């Protein structure tokens, strides 16, 4: 009654875009650690019942085409849609290997009037990318049924560990492994906000990037509660 109907043939599609390598002209470096993220997410959402597809080192044209092609599919037998973006980022934009493209334009393809077969069904977007250039020093679309889980607040940096993977994804996967089928989406992301806020603290030889923090940001337009099982 107050929950999203999950009685469908399948949970839905889960598109992961794993951009590790970028063209030199963009000025972006190698995102070491992303494969770890991509691998852990890949297993995670498969465990939930999603039909996951992983894409690697995509171009701006490729990212736009994938999502458009996806919104043109028949999601009638699906309960929801999920998409995770792992890449370099800046205010309102996400990087491809050849450049930059607006997040809003990437998610617009799934508005109700453009993807009727996903109306009244939740559309999830998890983004692991920076949204600006600010550091946390520490102390002591115009539509419904969308949810965005950014790895950091707007205008700030988002941290990644070359050996262990990004903080947001690591956290997200742990919480989903153990509580994915019994907690509500907002309960899961809240716990993730807490893990990234407490458990992690950055260390570098650079004094300007030493002992910094990070806090995820959830934007919700959902109209019901969301559970991935019965």
């Amino acid at each position: 009654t107050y929950q999203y109907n999950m009685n469908f043939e399948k949970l839905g599609k889960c598109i992961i875009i794993n951009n590790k390598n970028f063209d030199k002209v963009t000025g972006m470096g190698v995102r070491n650690g992303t494969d770890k993220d991509a691998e852990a997410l890949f297993k995670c959402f498969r465990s939930l019942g999603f039909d996951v597809i992983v894409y690697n080192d995509c171009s701006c044209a490729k990212m736009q085409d994938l999502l458009k092609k996806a919104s043109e599919e028949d999601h009638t037998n699906a309960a929801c849609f999920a998409c995770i973006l792992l890449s370099h980022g800046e205010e309102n934009v996400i990087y491809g290997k050849d450049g930059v493209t607006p997040i809003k334009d990437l998610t617009a393809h799934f508005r109700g009037d453009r993807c009727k077969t996903l109306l009244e069904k939740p559309k999830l977007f998890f983004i692991q990318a920076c949204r600006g250039t600010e550091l946390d020093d520490g102390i002591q679309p115009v539509e419904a049924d969308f949810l965005f889980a950014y790895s950091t607040v707007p205008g700030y940096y988002s941290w990644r560990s070359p050996g262990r993977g990004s903080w947001f994804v690591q956290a997200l996967c742990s919480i989903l492994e153990e509580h994915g089928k019994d907690l509500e989406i907002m309960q899961i992301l809240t716990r993730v906000n807490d893990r990234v806020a407490r458990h992690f603290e950055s260390q570098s030889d650079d004094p300007h990037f030493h002992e910094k923090k990070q806090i995820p940001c959830v934007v919700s337009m959902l109209t019901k509660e969301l559970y991935f099982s019965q």
Binding site: Q128, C130, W159, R160, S204
Partner: peptide, 4 residues
């Protein structure tokens, strides 16, 4: 640790 590196930034994104």
């Amino acid at each position: 640790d590196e930034v994104x």
